[model samples]
Target: MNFGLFFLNFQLKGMTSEAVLDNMIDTIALVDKDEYHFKTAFVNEHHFSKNGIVGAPMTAASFLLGLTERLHIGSLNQVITTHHPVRIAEEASLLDQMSDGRFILGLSDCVSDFEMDFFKRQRDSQQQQFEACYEILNDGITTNYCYANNDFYNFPKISINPHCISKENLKQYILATSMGVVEWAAKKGLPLTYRWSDTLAEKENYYQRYLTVAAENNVDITHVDHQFPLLVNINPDRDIAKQEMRDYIRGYIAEAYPNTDQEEKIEELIKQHAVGTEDEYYESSKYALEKTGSKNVLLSFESMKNKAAVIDLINMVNEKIKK
Candidate 1:
């Protein structure tokens, strides 16, 4: 049971941008130690919203990559609509070199109107744009040279500077939500990161569908590393942990989506998150793995009360759940 951390990048109550980033870096540093049971990490990429502050995930990822020796860091889902694929390839390839292949580039379409309208990206062609960007990004990073003339991009043949460290071994994935995207990922032989909101049953459905599609498309998925994200908040006192998670979600919703009736939303979110003692987390994680056959579990710790508590939970996970 492999583990990875997901940085939501949302500001906690009274936490400044500096504090948020500092805590995240501290958490990553803890996990980088050899004794910790963490493998990879994923960071959010959101624009204009304090709900998810990692607008330039590659920058954060670069810093994190330089700090950590073993952990492979990546964007949870980098919104690729704004930037041209060439730029993405150039920076990502450089990071690939710096990290010595310990970098993954997870791509996604822009979902929010806040971002779409600001970037002047049309909603209608978003899916097509996503696919095109994926194509161009991959070609620019992996091949010696790439040329593009399409609905989204038109560029002459050129080689990207700072070629990918291991072009053939470049790692990336899609944040597959709908079955349409899932099937496309399968055809491309790319792994997927499932949404945190997806139910255990929903993930099983998607997992089975991916396998079926991969088989029909003749895409070998033997080494694919599909991930399932889980929000985790565990403590020695189970009741305290649950309360802390509930309060955190409520506060987050209040700040991020003010004026909306979020009590129901908060309740539903609390139900989905893993909040309990270490043994409880172990059981929930054990059952999830047995039920879904998930290879990786990506976790978000926004429910934690403080930075120190986050590391404490990770240490507990290393001992009880990871073992």
Candidate 2:
């Protein structure tokens, strides 16, 4: 199984974006080292809020790719509905060339109405917009020259300069948040990465749907790249580790649901995560891997701020858990 690190880039009060970025650099450097052998690092794209940094995922991805040698940098997801598909295709091609095919791409719709309005996209037609955008993106990257006269986009035939690597060489993931998007991904035969809140049963259902659709379309699915995210925080004192994870979850939930009882919500959410002693973490990881046929394990260390602690967690997993 392959491993990857995912950064949400959420800054705490009084924390500067620079500091968060520096921490990301340190975290990636540790994982990029030979011992851990992490294959990729992902950053999210969000705007107008401290809730998420890395508004320009292309720039952030380019910086991270240049800084690391073996680690491929990817957008956990780039919001495609906001930008012109051609611009995205161009930037993606440039990144692929600059990183020597080490830049992974994830495409998805805007997270909420706030972003949708800001980008002048109608809330009701988001799915249609996303569909149009992705088609243009696929055509733009794969063909020598492409043109689109779709409901949402109209562009003359143009070829992107610094041509992208072949589709097979450049890995792309679909952030399959909804059943509609999941169905779309299945039809396209792209890999899927689901949300953190999705249950194991829900993921299995989605996987089955994807398989059925791909089979109907005669699309190969034998080696598709599917990611299952597992949160981790290891401490000798299991209770301390649990508390740390709880605190982080509490902070996160509070931000997302300001009026709700965060502690109750945390209890519900934390059970799915791996946070405890090494042995406990190992058992949880093993169970997750066994239950889900996920090809890649995406590790989230948002709970732990210390680079040393994060390294220790990854090191322990690499030495004891990865198979």
Candidate 3:
């Protein structure tokens, strides 16, 4: 099975971006120094004020490559609403050059922008919309989006600089939540990042859906990566661990979490979330592996106590799962 570490930039009252970025970079340095067998990494483009480092495509790749060599890193979802295809293509060129082609660019629209894109879809389906965007990106490079005067807004074209690196062979991952999006990823014959559930049944449901959709289109689903927002506590009772993380889980899951005030629903949500026991933790992961026909797991340690807490959780995993 393949393994990866993820960085999620978030806003914490009284915390500054400087501190968050410092801790994140320091964490990457520590991970490299420790020589963990991790081969890949994932990050998101959060608010610049809180998560500036990973906000820029190719920019994050620049700093991260300095931290570790041969680590294929990519964003969880870069907001294309803020970046044009030509610009992103140029960014891809720089990353491909710097990393010697060991870079992946996973693109996704923001909730705000994606919703508007869906709304204005007189004929654009999710797949169609993605294909259009990809066409622009591909055309910008393969054929080249060549022009000038309008800020000359581009690169990766011979017309711009010293013959930009071609991104024709760049690996890609798609973040697909909905059914159609999952099918879209499968249709492209690419691995996708999807949410995991503590319940084996729920995990199978989504994984199976991806398979069925892919099969219907005569596409092969080779590997899919499941995301686990983990929080493994050392507390004696599992309930204590669950309650300790309710606040963090709320923020991590955001709207997907049940927002009801009912105590029963709260307990159910906690039960299915990452706030649980060691035995439960190991078993849930194994269950996921068995169900998804996937070997890779993306670990999101944001549901932990804090910075040091997530580091601790990773250590715990290395100690328990890896060792």
Candidate 4:
């Protein structure tokens, strides 16, 4: 089993981007130490706080490859709506070289039209745009000379630059839970990493259904990269630990769902978050792994301004989750 970490809507607490980068590098160094072996580290292409300064994973991925060993840094997802396929291909090539063939591209988009329009000047349907976008991306990586000859895009043949790593080694993973998206990834033979928002059984069912269609296309598909929010506060007073994370949960959720009530959502996550004693956290982690039929799990957590707590969580994961 492999473990991945997704860094998102963080606690900058008045720190500048440079300081934030410094802290992130140090955090990765600490987690990469002998005790923890997180194979992948991910971030979103567009992650920001309406409340404070925010940064994205690619910003970190661009540099993290050189700073650590055996850690594949990538995006939880890069929303393709805002980027031209040609531009994306250039970025992909750079990441591939930057990571020394360790980079993995991830792509996803919003489901709602209301949200999609926020980007302004886009396709009427995201499906058409998405299909057309990847057509260019794939061709850009595979063929030396390419043209985006799709309904949504028509580009003159241009040579792809930066010279990406080989197609077989630099792979892409789709982060999505929609059946349509799952089938798309499977048909393309791309692996998937989706959020575990529902019961584990429901997730397994989704995978089973998606795999059947993928097999028809002769695509080898099995297993999923299930993502979840993990909180392990080894504080003596667990309530305080939960309290510390409450604002983070609230702010993060509020940004994700601006129309919803933030306070209620914060409480919802607090109860569901893995905040308990070492034994209790261990038990929950065990069950989460047992129920999910995935060998790869992506965890998103905030250290909540306590590096010590995160170190403890890492130790617990190595001892309990990784065991």
- TM-score, each model? 0.88, 0.90, 0.74, 0.82
List model 3 lDDT by residue over 128-210, tens digit each. Answer: 55555655565544444544222213334343222346545566665555566666666667666554322345556667887
Sort all candidates by TM-score, best to worst: 2, 1, 4, 3
What's the distance in Å from true for residue 184, model 2?
Answer: 0.7
Comparing candidate 2 with candidate 4, which one achieves the higher TM-score? 2
Tens-digit lDDT track of model 4 for 252-290: 565656776777656554554565455454554555555
**Which stretches of model 1 miss by more than 4 angstroms?**
236-239, 250-265, 281-285, 290-292, 320-323
Per-residue lDDT tens digits for candidate 2, residues 1-323, read 88788887777777888988888788887778776667888887777667677788778888888887888888888889888888888888888888888888877776666678887998888989999988887777776466888678887988887777765567888876777888888887788876654555567678888888889999888888788777777777888888877766555576545666767667655666677776563564566565555788888877675667776667766775456
What ranking emerges by lDDT with the best candidate at the front? 1, 2, 4, 3
List clash counts for every candidate, in order.
0, 0, 0, 0
Q: How far is candidate 4 from the true structure (C-alpha RMSD, Å)?
A: 3.5
Q: Which model, 1 or 3, shows the larger lDDT?
A: 1
Candidate 3 lDDT at 306 equals 49
Q: Compute the lDDT of residue 174 as modeled in candidate 1.
A: 75
Q: How close to the true structure is residue 242 of candidate 1, measured as C-alpha lDDT?
A: 81
Which of the numbered candidates is closest to the native, going by highest lDDT? 1
State candidate 1's TM-score.
0.88
Give Cα distance to truth, residue 23, candidate 2, Å.
0.9
